[PDB]
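Appendix B: complex inputs.
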Amino acid sequence: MVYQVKDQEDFTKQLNEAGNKLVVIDFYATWCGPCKMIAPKLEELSQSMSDVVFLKVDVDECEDIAQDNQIACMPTFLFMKNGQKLDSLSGANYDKLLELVEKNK
Amino acid sequence: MVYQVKDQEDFTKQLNEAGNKLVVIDFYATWCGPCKMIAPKLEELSQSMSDVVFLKVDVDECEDIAQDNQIACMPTFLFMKNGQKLDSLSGANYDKLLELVEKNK
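Resulting structure:
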């Protein structure tokens, strides 16, 4: 599953429940074509990879979280572990997403 | 001064108000750092140039307009003249912007 982050403290709650697991966060908008195209692939990946936590942040609903992470393109995938940033990817390139999750998991 | 488009009808009103002038529309968000960096440069070009009209669209306030224009990064600049799309530029590349303004005005 891909869990939808509700607000700043909810994002922190999720980053903790992840324990030591890689967390992949998709920053998206509902008006954005490339975001809608890749969303189902992220959902398929999340059902299989139970040792990675997948989250999503709607930038219109969570403008403060978007500003905290310096988002400018969408989708942007942020890679985190233990509350700390590992890597980011801008755009819907599913092979680069898979490479980054392989690298970081 | 850069005018903020309020809604789809207002976009048509301003396209009509521009007459035969090139129109540059900055699709931006208030949480987006590169947009904030370039906004004062746009205000300076808007006060400087009398043969170009500068508009802005807040993607979180006009999500419909952003969808219809296939926005995915920000800022994105659309270049229009007599209702026609001439060019677009993704990102806060001020030199490219000025080059597309000089080419199309």
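Strands of chain B lie at 3-4, 22-28, 52-58, 76-81, 84-90.
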